[PDB]
From a paper:
[name] belongs to the CYP255A family of [name] enzymes. Our recent characterization of a two-component P450 enzyme system consisting of a reductase, GcoB, and a P450 oxidase, [name], demonstrated that it demethylates diverse aromatic compounds, including guaiacol (which can be derived from coniferyl alcohol and represents the aromatic functionality of G-lignin that must undergo demethylation), guaethol, anisole (methoxybenzene), 2-methylanisole, and 3-methoxycatechol (3MC) with similar or greater efficiency than other O-aryl-demethylases described in the literature. However, GcoAB shows poor reactivity toward syringol, which can be derived from sinapyl alcohol via high-temperature reactions and represents the aromatic functionality of S-lignin that must undergo O-demethylation for further catabolism via ring-opening dioxygenases. In the present study, we hypothesized that substitution of [name]-F169, which has the closest interaction with the bound substrate, may relax the specificity of the enzyme sufficiently to permit the O-demethylation of S-lignin type substrates.
The closest contact is with [name]-F169, which forms a hydrophobic interaction with the C6 carbon on the aromatic ring of guaiacol. A broader survey of variants at the [name]-F169 position (amino acids S, H, V, I, and L in addition to A) confirmed that [name]-F169A exhibits the best catalytic performance in terms of both specific activity and reaction coupling, although other small side chains (S and V) also permitted reactivity with syringol, suggesting that these may permit syringol to assume a reactive conformation at the heme. Each protein variant also crystallized successfully with guaiacol and the structures showed that the orientation of the bound ligand remained consistent with that of the WT enzyme. Furthermore, comparison of the surrounding active site architecture confirmed no significant deviation from the WT.
Author numbering: 5 to 407
Amino acid sequence: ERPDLAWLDEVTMTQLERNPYEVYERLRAEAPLAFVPVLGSYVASTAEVCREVATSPDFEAVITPAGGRTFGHPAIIGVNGDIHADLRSMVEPALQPAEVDRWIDDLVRPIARRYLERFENDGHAELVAQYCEPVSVRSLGDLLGLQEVDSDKLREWFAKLNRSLTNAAVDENGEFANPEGFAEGDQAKAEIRAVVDPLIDKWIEHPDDSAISHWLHDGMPPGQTRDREYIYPTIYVYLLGAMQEPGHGMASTLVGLFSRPEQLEEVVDDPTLIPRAIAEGLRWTSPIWSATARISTKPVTIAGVDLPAGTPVMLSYGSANHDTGKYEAPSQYDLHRPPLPHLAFGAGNHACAGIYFANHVMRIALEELFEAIPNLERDTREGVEFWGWGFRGPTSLHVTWEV
Ligand code: HEM
Ligand SMILES: COc1ccccc1O
């Protein structure tokens, strides 16, 4: 236990969920790599340390304790070596930029229009539930082969998987403080299996262009498929972050633009600025804020801490994206911030595989939104509330517009 960080003993899980930024501002200044008692783990808070751990030859992927309870094995985020290579080879084809460009417009734009058509004449909406999350999950759901799973269900699953994977609080002995907080995740996985098992049954016999059918068949000997147990954890990885994050990215971007009304106006008038707006939104409130981790594979010194082999380090990329070593006034959304590298997609061998896809999903969603509702205003009756330490995003985004 590090004496000058005794105050970390009093940091609570709820505090980190409500707003982790004050604690992490202290961490970035005091201890870029610091053992946080309630999390039971070292956490990397600065860009330099997060990038170093994520790319180091002396680290490899590890799933967090709560992530492991949520996804099991072999979750693509938590494995290495040959299994990771296979799972990356499995997911990467549909995510290849040239492939995404072939169909992303015809995938996402009709979906965005569909959800827009339900409310664009109302003069008010709650964009997280009515637009950002449905576009995000409907787009990926259709890509995966889950066309028949309604957006409400996909959204419920990622919400439950989120809370399960981020159920990280531990007591003084390192045991989960809230062991009952995984049951809901277990329930969501049971539901998912009930839906996806017959789809897999079908895809084994009748492959199609769905991503999950390709996960079963691609690269396999004739007549063989990857075992469903082998791919289910990566399905869960998708049904959490891949479903959740584009929607949170677009919503956080809107919140940031609303916080800079002149920049909102600039982006509406010039939608070519939407990619920049999104990249700044992801830096400003990173959707994957501290969900993943790495484990040292040999003794290594990181930020002056001599870590034994086998030491987990949580990658709080959301804090790294407020590193004042890199950014001026990082808590302020600023479209006109110089484009600098950011860590919202992680780094290294286990960096986000779906960056190009995700950026286009968010781009197209905001393009259609601003075209349909160019006079969007935030419902300033209250502030926007953001929630989450592992994954972070606005819980709601009430807007209005003159009809
Ligand atoms: C704005 C949206 C998204 C953000 C901010 C995001 C961010 C991230 C981050 C931070 C990680 C962990 C990287 C690390 O630990 O170093 C990750 C992993 C991953 N993401 Fe993305 N993600 C997004 C959307 C998506 C989508 C839509 C997909 C799939 C279509 C996807 C697929 C993956 C995969 C497969 C991994 C695991 C990579 C590995 O462990 O090898 N992501 N993502
Ligand atoms: C792409 O989905 C994830 C990424 C990182 C951690 C958990 C996830 O479900």
